[PDB]
Design a protein around this ligand. Structure first.
Ligand SMILES: COC1=C(OC)C(=O)C(CC=C(C)C)=C(C)C1=O
Ligand SMILES: [Zn+2]
Lengths: 134, 188
């Protein structure tokens, strides 16, 4: 697993990244949230329970539980709005971590200097991720 | 028993003095804010539950629209001075979001022209201190309620608004269920 994710994880982490800055700097609040429903899982899904050892690969199935779950809707919703708006909602340009998990938005939003694919690949990288493991 | 922090309102952590009793935010770009006011008229609605002559204020904000946002704000700020608001909210929402025919200070200018505001009278105060003060009164009012998104609402500068504490399927209901939360916080 590790590689096949990392190989691709990198190749899409950076497909965002590589260009994030070349993309000049397109606005996004979903931005982080979704890029965190990424690096929050992949990084600690390679390292997760497929891990530094492979005879206990169920911590990841948990890390792949709450993983692209959000990854799904974080994009899902996000895109649900983009032509189909709704009152009980917002539109921001802001940091947040409801427990002082702070540095995370003084770096990946900071050192960053098309929904199309995301929304689908956030869910594409889900059923395939579950089927073969669970 | 039946009225909850983190549920239908959240209590502001760092609560701001000299504050407007109830105060909303919004841009002329957030399809949601557009909903909030265009579609559900929430203000008007909420206006009506409120006790006798309790100040219901409303401020516009910047992040969305870089250059224009500001002027939109400044422009707006005027309407606050002339007490014209009521007659321009709607052209402007529309002009900006729905009709997509607003691009410059004047397109806007023209809308005040259009709505019964005299081109010179609308500039007389645009550059006036009256306005400039007011702009900041906003710029700073956001900054005070540590603001991130819009639309948003805050009571006696103590209580921010959790609209998710409420129904999302029935409008008719959500609204009243909304205005309620506000009333509740106006004698707290
Ligand atoms: C609209 O906001 C967002 C972006 O736009 C700048 C992104 O690039 C990205 C990341 C892009 C890729 C291709 C992973 C996310 C997650 C996002 O929410
Ligand atoms: Zn209507």
């Amino acid at each position: 697993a590790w590689l096949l994710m990392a190989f691709t994880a990198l190749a899409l982490e950076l497909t965002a990244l590589w260009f994030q800055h070349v993309m000049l700097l397109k606005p996004c609040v979903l931005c982080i949230y979704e890029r965190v429903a990424l690096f929050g899982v992949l990084g600690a899904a390679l390292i997760g329970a497929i891990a530094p050892k492979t005879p206990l690969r169920y911590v990841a199935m948990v890390i792949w539980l709450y993983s692209a779950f959000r990854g799904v809707q974080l994009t899902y919703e996000h895109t649900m709005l983009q032509l189909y708006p709704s009152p009980f909602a917002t539109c921001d340009f802001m940091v947040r971590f409801p427990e002082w998990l702070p540095l995370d938005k003084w770096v990946p939003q900071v050192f960053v200097a098309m929904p199309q694919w995301l929304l689908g690949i956030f869910i594409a990288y889900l059923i395939v991720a579950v089927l073969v493991v669970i | 028993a039946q009225y909850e922090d983190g549920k239908q309102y959240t209590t502001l952590e760092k609560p701001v003095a000299g504050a407007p009793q109830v105060l909303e935010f919004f841009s002329f770009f957030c399809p949601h804010a557009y909903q909030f006011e265009e579609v559900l008229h929430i203000s008007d609605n909420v206006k009506k539950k409120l006790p006798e002559g309790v100040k219901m204020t409303k401020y516009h904000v910047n992040f969305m629209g870089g250059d224009l946002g500001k002027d939109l704000t400044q422009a707006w700020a005027v309407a606050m001075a002339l007490g014209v608001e009521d007659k321009v909210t709607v052209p402007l929402f529309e002009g900006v979001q729905k009709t997509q025919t607003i691009r410059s200070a004047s397109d806007i200018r023209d809308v005040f022209i259009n709505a019964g505001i005299k081109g010179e009278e609308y500039d007389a105060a645009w550059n006036s201190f009256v306005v400039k003060s007011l702009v900041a009164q906003q710029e700073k009012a956001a900054a005070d309620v540590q603001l991130r998104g819009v639309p948003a609402m805050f009571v006696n500068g103590k209580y921010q608004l959790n609209p998710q504490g409420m129904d999302t399927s029935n409008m008719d209901v959500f609204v009243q269920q909304y205005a309620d939360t506000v009333k509740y916080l106006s004698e707290k």
